[PDB]
């Protein structure tokens, strides 16, 4: 028993965090086969990143411009080429510590967890959601840019995130490893903001089943809702509306808790409109929306990778 | 900006988890330079569990009874021996992927990262603190026992904890790499039950100074307080008296926040006494005692 934000065992990452340095400015990159992803914003200067144009930028670098170092080891930048936000650094050696992976991007809601890095090396592993607002509300310094968000799949790595910036409300933006940000957020020196987050009702659920799988009962009740209900109750508290598919997702935790769907929804609105009562779940005394319903199942079960 | 629980990478200490058979019995073992290192439980029988002789059920035991595997490769025990309540099997083949390591065994409030393995394989990673009654709040199912908990400063692994056991109101007890036990517990199955535990009151307070770093100082007052008056306040709460050495540790977040710890101490006492008032510190509406003030500089700077 017990219950603890969990994130994947980073070794398979960590063997492929290496820093890159162009001019000034020293980030993080990851080195799979024979490339170096990293964020194209590496090319930037304080003045470029106002404005940029980041094929402008990019055609005047060289490739002895990009200082690729793994460990102790420098790389040899062979080519560079760029896709959307995210540079890609050709290299003459292929990461021999490159394991099975795949580019996914995530959908709001998803968890992942994040190997934040400094200088090539990582330093710590947390599991974070992607917002419903498309930001992530990470743990990064100066530096931590190119630390990348993973989840593993048996013994593949699915890249879902790189870090490429920290909005002024202290939120993260980044991208996928195709470059693409998530969210309306651009790389560059602008005004930018966060839109009003909203709770990740289906997680909540998921974590309200995790704590009934612990032995917390109290929340629960004898009633039961309609999901339009649910979902009228749960717009008016910045909750994400819960669809057919969250209903269906998290039919296995119903199963084994023996509490429907709906049944859990009516003790989610009662928690809504009259609060915890000084009472805690799992040690919390709010409700937990980072905790999928598969990140339930793989911790409440003990899955390994 | 931000302020998480993060867990050390666990790269290092993934290269190091095995799986260890005796019997009918399977759990993890940390396999480091030539030795195997496991709960000695792995070798209890059922009626070996209430009152074990270890030493006699050690004896009875030859190099061939344990079953280690590595991956999907069986390594041969050459030796084994015990050490208070950890196993130690010498092994034929070194571990290529052994990192720098020390063993070390940390004090109550000390955090730490848990590699929760089954199986000799890594499924997560969570950050932990020894509670002050010398548990563990981890989160272990059946098979994790052998999984360990360490701390990565610097390129050395300092491991600090081996799972062994789960107490009744589902909180764990383990050991530190050299087999002694965290707290009054025994591998026996035996009626044993964690303290009350209280609130590490150090890392509360390392924890509000991170809230300060990170722009939240509604918690702020223009209080101070006596150590002595902290402490008969914070007792009363269920908190760790807060000592000398306490108030010393907190100095560097003291100089860089410009709240004394004393005056920190008063917002403490400040918000045990009214709640939050519906209002959050860093996402959490309970005051946080799993990050220590070595833990907030790291994160921090
Ligand atoms: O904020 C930046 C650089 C940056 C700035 C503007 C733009 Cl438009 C872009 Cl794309 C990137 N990265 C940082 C990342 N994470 C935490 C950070 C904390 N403190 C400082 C920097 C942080
Ligand atoms: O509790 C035991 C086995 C055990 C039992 C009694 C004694 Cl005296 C000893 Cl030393 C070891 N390990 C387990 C570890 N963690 C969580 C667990 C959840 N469920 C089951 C087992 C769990
Ligand atoms: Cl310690």
């Known amino acids: 028993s017990g219950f ?3 994130a994947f065992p980073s070794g398979k990452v960590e063997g492929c965090m290496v820093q890159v340095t162009c001019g000034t400015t020293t980030l993080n990159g990851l080195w799979l086969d024979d ?3 990293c964020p194209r914003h590496v090319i930037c200067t304080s003045e470029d990143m106002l404005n940029p144009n980041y094929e402008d930028l990019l055609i005047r670098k060289s490739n002895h411009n990009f200082l690729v170092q793994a460990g102790n080891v420098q790389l040899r930048v062979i080519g560079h080429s760029m896709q959307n936000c995210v540079l890609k650094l050709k290299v003459d050696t292929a990461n021999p510590k490159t394991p099975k992976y795949k580019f996914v ?3 709001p809601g998803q968890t992942f ?3 934040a890095c400094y200088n090539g090396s990582p330093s710590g592993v947390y599991q974070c959601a992607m917002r419903p607002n498309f930001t992530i509300k990470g743990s990064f310094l100066n530096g931590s840019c190119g630390s990348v968000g993973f989840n593993i799949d048996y013994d593949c790595v699915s890249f879902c ?3 490429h910036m920290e909005l002024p409300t202290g939120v993260h933006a980044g991208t996928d490893l195709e470059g693409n940000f998530y969210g309306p957020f651009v790389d560059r020196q602008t005004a930018q903001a966060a839109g009003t987050d909203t709770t990740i009702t289906v997680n909540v659920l998921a974590w309200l089943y995790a704590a009934v799988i612990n032995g917390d009962r109290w929340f629960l009740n004898r009633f039961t809702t309609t999901l339009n209900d649910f979902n009228l109750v749960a717009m008016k508290y910045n909750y994400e509306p819960l669809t057919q598919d969250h209903v269906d997702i ?4 119903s199963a084994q808790t023996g509490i429907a769907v709906l049944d859990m929804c009516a003790s989610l609105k009662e928690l809504l409109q009259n609060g915890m009562n000084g009472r805690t779940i ?4 709010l409700l937990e929306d980072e905790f999928t319903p598969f990140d339930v ?3 409440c079960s003990g899955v390994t990778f």
């Open 282 to 285: 799992l040690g919390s005394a």
């Open 297 to 299: 199942v793989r911790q």
């Open 161 to 163: 995130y790189m870090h």
């Open 105 to 107: 991007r995530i959908q």
């Open 4 to 6: 603890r934000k969990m």
């Open 35 to 37: 490339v170096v992803y």
């Open 113 to 115: 967890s994040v190997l």
């Open 250 to 253: 998290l039919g296995p935790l």
